[PDB]
Amino acid sequence: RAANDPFTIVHGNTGKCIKPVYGWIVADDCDETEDKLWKWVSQHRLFHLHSQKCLGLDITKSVNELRMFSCDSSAMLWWKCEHHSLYGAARYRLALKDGHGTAISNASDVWKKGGSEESLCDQPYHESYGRPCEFPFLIDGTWHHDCILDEDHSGPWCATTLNYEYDRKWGICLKQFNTQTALSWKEAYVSCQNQGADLLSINSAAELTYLKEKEGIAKIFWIGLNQLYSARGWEWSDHKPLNFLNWDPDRPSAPTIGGSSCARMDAESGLWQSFSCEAQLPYVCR
Amino acid sequence: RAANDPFTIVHGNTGKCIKPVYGWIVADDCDETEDKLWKWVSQHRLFHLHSQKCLGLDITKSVNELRMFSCDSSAMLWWKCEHHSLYGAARYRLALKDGHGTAISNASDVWKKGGSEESLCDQPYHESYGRPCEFPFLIDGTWHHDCILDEDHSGPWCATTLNYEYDRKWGICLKQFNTQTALSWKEAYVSCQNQGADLLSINSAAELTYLKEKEGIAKIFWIGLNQLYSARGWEWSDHKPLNFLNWDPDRPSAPTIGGSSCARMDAESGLWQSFSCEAQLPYVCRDTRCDAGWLPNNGFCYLLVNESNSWDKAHAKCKFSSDLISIHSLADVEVVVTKLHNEDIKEEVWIGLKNINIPTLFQWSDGTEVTLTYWDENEPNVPYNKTPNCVSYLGELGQWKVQSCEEKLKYVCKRKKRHGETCYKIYEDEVPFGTNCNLTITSRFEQEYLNDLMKKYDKSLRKYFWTGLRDVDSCGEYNWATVGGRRRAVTFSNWNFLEPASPGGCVAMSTGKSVGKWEVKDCRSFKALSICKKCPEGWQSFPASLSCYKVFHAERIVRKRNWEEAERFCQALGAHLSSFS
C-alpha cells in the first residue's frame, strides 16, 4: 500500500530529535514514541498529532523566530526537501544549535527518519460525492488528522472541505461500485492505488455478464483501459492480457487526434467509446 | 489579435541577420525580406519559410556541426530563449564567428528581432473535429507552414496529424456554432483568443431565446462562465455584468468541492449545470456637504441603518425618504469596507436586488446600471424558483451572497486610468527592472483594485508585473522595497502554495492561473511590465531656545538662501539644524 504513516524526524550528526513545547522546540528526550509523532499534511506541511500544534515561519522582524502557530491562519507555513536537507520559507533550513531549531539558512545540516537511511521526503502526500479528505481539520474545537470513528456514523468519516464549520459537507473515509461518486479517472486511479488495489480487469465474459445485470451501479463508469505507455496501444492498470475487447461501432475511434486517449463504458448496452477521462465520473476499482 | 507572424532574427552588436544556404549559414546580406524569413513551429522549433529547411543540432562527433536538417527526422531540434540570448540542445548558444553560427556555449551573445527591442520569445506558440493544425507539414513533397488556399476545398485547409501521408485526416483552418467539434473549454478559449474574439456573453433573454430555437447547434456546449479569478464567484470571458443566470435545480451545486468550477449549458431545457470542462465538447464564442453621518461619494451619500429587521421592512423603511445602496464603481466598495465599524466581521449587510420573471434575471431596484458584480468565491446561492430574491454583503472584502432573508439584519441606504484619488498608468514594454517608477502596496483592497484593472487590461496568460518587494543585502529579509529609505513593516502577504524558492531577487505578479499572487523569480534580467500610481562684533541671537541662530532676509541677500547647503559653511563651527526642544 501507500499511505502517510506516523514517523519521527531525527538529526544525522548527533542523536537529537524534535520535541515540541508550548510554543517552541526543546532538546531530544528521544527514543520514546508516546508523544513525539509527526505526519505530512496538505500544502506540504508538518503536523504533530499529540500536541496538535504545527510549526511555521513568521518573518516580521529582523530575526524571524521559529515558534508554534495555529494551522488555520495566514502564517505562510510549508517545508520542502533538498538533496540531504529541508528548506522552509525561502532557502531557510531548520538549523540546530544544540537545543532549539531556528532559521539561519545554513548549508550544513541533515535530517532523516528514525533508525533508517531516508530523506523523509521520498513518499509523497497521501490521502460529499466521495471527494478526497482534507487533513487536518478543526472539529469540536480540536484538530484531527485521521478519519476517527464515533457513534454518529457507521465507521470512519472525514471532512470534504477546508472549513467544515462553515460548509458542513462530510464524506466516508474510503479505505466496489461507488455510485454518485464522480471523480477523475486519474484521481480515481491514484485513490485506489493509495488503497493498494488496481482498476477493473475484464478477463472473461462471465464478469461482464455479471456486471451488466447489476442494479447498484451507474450507467457510465471507468474500467481503466488506457495507454500510460505512449508506445503501446491499450493496457489495463495491472499487467493483464488483452484478449477481450468491447469497442464501439458508432464512433470512428480516432487513434490520437480527433478523439482522445481514454475508454468510457456504457453498461446499458456494454459499449466502449473513446473519450477524455479527465472529468468527474463514477468508476470501480477491484 | 494574437497570432504568429514571420520575422527575422538579427544580432545586437553586429548588424547581421541569419541567412541560410544549401546546408549552412552565411553572412548577413540583410535588410531584404524577399528570401530571409523565419517562424516558430511546434516542439519549440525554428522554420524557414522560403528554403523550407529547419536547423538542428546533431551531437555525433567532437565538434557538433550546425547544419540544416529535415524537420521530419530524429535530429532533436529545439531552441529556447535565455534572458538575453538563445540556447539550444544543452546550454548551447548560437555563437557567431563573423559569418557562421556554431555552438561553443559562450555567455556573450545577444539576438533580437528586426529593428525593435524584443527577446523574440515574448509571444508564445500560436496555432477532423476542429483539432488544432500541425505546423509544418510535408505535402506534395514540399514543406508548408500555413493553411494555403487551393481549388480542392472552399477556403483554407490544414492537417490534423503529424504525418498526413499516413493518416489522411485534414481539417478546416479556423480563423459561430462549430458543431461536431469536441474540444476542451481551455482549448476553445485559447483558440478563440488566438482569433481575437471572446466566449459567449449572454446579457439579455432575447439572445438566449434566439439560441433556443437554433437548429444548427449542439444540445450540449460551453458558454464560458468560469472563475479564472479564485477570489470571485463567476465571470465571463470579457468583463460583462452578471445579471442573467439560468442555474439548475436538480444538482445541489456544490461550491468548490463535491462539484466543480465550470458551467455547462443544456439548451433542450435551458439549464446551467456545474461540471468540469476539461473534456472535449463543442462550444461557441462571439464638494457636497451631507447631513449628519451620511458619507458623500460623488454627489450622493451613503449611510448604514442600525436597525435589525427583515427584508420587507428594510425595503419599506428607507425606500426614511431615501433609496438603497447602489454599487456602480470601485470606490463605493472601499467606502463600504472602511466604514461599518470594522465591518462587523461576523455579521451581514443587506442590498436591494429584485427579480420577478423566470428564469433569474437581476435588475436594480432604482435604475438599470448593473456594471460591477462582486460575488463570493464561490457561493452564488441561486435557488430553484422563488419570487422574492435578496442580496447580502458578507465578509471583510464585501462579497455578495444570497441568503434566505427571513431573519432580521441591518442594511445601508443612500440619499441625494483613474480610481478617485490617484491614477494608475501602464507602459507598453519594460525590459529592465523599474527604471522609471516603483509601485508600492500597503493594503489588500488596493491589491484587489489593481488586479481588477489588470484583468480589464490583460486578457491572456504568459504575462508578468512588478511589485515593490526585493532585497539587495542577500540576507533573507523581505520588506516593501523602494528607491531607498523604506523601513515599513509588511502588513499583508499573499503568497502561492510554495512561492518563495530563492533567498533574494525581485518578485513578480502573474494573472494566468494563480491570479493576484506575488510570484518569485530572479532579478538579473527579467522582461516584465509594471503599473505606476499617478556678541563680539555683528551678532544677533536669542537664548530663548538654548541655541544661537543666524538667519537672513529675502531682499538684502544676494541670492535666495536656505538651510540646505548650510552644512558647507556652518559645520566648520559644529552647527546643525534649528534645534528646538
Author numbering:
A (entry chain C): 30 to 156, 164 to 211, 231 to 341
B (entry chain D): 30 to 156, 164 to 211, 231 to 341, 358 to 390, 392 to 488, 508 to 625, 643 to 689
Sentences from the paper on this structure:
DEC-205 (CD205), a member of the macrophage mannose receptor protein family, is the prototypic endocytic receptor of dendritic cells, whose ligands include phosphorothioated cytosine–guanosine oligonucleotides, a motif often seen in bacterial or viral DNA. The MR protein family is characterized by a conserved domain architecture that comprises an N-terminal cysteine-rich (CysR) domain, a fibronectin type II (FNII) domain, and 8 or 10 contiguous C-type lectin-like domains (CTLDs). Here, DEC-205 is thought to function as a promiscuous endocytic receptor that captures a diverse repertoire of foreign and self-antigens and internalize them for antigen processing and cross-presentation. Namely, DEC-205, PLA2R, and the avian IgY receptor FcRY are all reported to exist in a compact conformation at low pH and transition to an extended state under basic conditions, although the mechanism of such rearrangements are unknown.
Building on this finding, we observed a large change in the elution profile of DEC-205 at pH 8.0, eluting with a mass four times that of the monomer, suggesting that in basic conditions DEC-205 formed a stable tetramer. We next performed cryo-EM analysis on the DEC-205 tetramer in basic conditions (pH 8.0). Here, the DEC-205 tetramer formed a 115 × 200 × 100 Å toroid shaped particle with a large central cavity and was ultimately resolved to 4.9 Å. The overall architecture of the DEC-205 tetramer revealed a major rearrangement of the second CTLD ring that enabled four protomers to assemble into a prolate toroid with clear D2 symmetry in the 2D class averages and final reconstruction. In contrast to the structural conservation of the first ring, the C-terminus underwent a dramatic rearrangement to form a tail–tail interaction along the median of the toroid. Within this extended confirmation, CTLD8 from one protomer contacted CTLD4 of the opposing protomer and vice versa. The cryo-EM reconstruction was unambiguous for the placement of the 10 (CysR to CTLD8) domains except for CTLD5. Here, the cryo-EM reconstruction suggests that CTLD5 is highly mobile within the tetramer, and the domain could act as an allosteric center for DEC-205’s pH-dependent rearrangements. As observed in the DEC-205 monomer, CTLD9 and 10 were absent from the final reconstruction, solidifying the notion that they are a highly dynamic part of the protein. Broadly the BSA of the protomer 1 and 2 head–head interaction accounted for ∼2300 Å2, whereas the protomer 1 and 3 tail—tail interaction was ∼1500 Å.
